[PDB]
Amino acid sequence: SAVDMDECKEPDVCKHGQCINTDGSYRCECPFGYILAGNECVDTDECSVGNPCGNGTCKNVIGGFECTCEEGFEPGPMMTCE
Ligand SMILES: [Ca+2]
Ligand SMILES: [Ca+2]
């Protein structure tokens, strides 16, 4: 059999996003939290906002970000201070 070129599944296209195999092309579509650097899809710098925790400091993570509120608290995976 023969399948049309994926175009996005290639190591030089998307490589980390929800693409859309078209008839003669594709369409990279990174999720909410990622971006597109011309073809490679990955996470952006969420800590570039300003400590989403509430007072501590922000850090860059995947699907969101990380943070270290004033030592003595308990943050989360990628949400805010809690
Ligand atoms: Ca295709
Ligand atoms: Ca991030």
Side-chain angles (χ1 to χ4, degrees):
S1 241
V3 55
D4 191 48
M5 296 130 219
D6 190 313
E7 312 139 324
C8 81
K9 214 250 142 130
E10 303 218 57
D12 230 350
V13 188
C14 289
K15 254 231 132 242
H16 253 326
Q18 175 213 58
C19 68
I20 284 87
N21 198 252
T22 76
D23 59 295
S25 228
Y26 49 108
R27 313 182 135 165
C28 219
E29 243 233 71
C30 242
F32 208 126
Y34 287 61
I35 74 302
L36 188 65
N39 245 336
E40 202 189 282
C41 236
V42 275
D43 229 44
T44 186
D45 178 348
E46 272 84 302
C47 160
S48 234
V49 187
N51 158 267
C53 260
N55 225 85
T57 39
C58 51
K59 173 132 50 232
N60 197 15
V61 96
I62 294 108
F65 35 97
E66 212 108 297
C67 151
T68 289
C69 261
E70 158 256 22
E71 225 55 20
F73 92 117
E74 268 269 79
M78 31 139 180
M79 268 275 196
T80 196
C81 205
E82 50 154 53

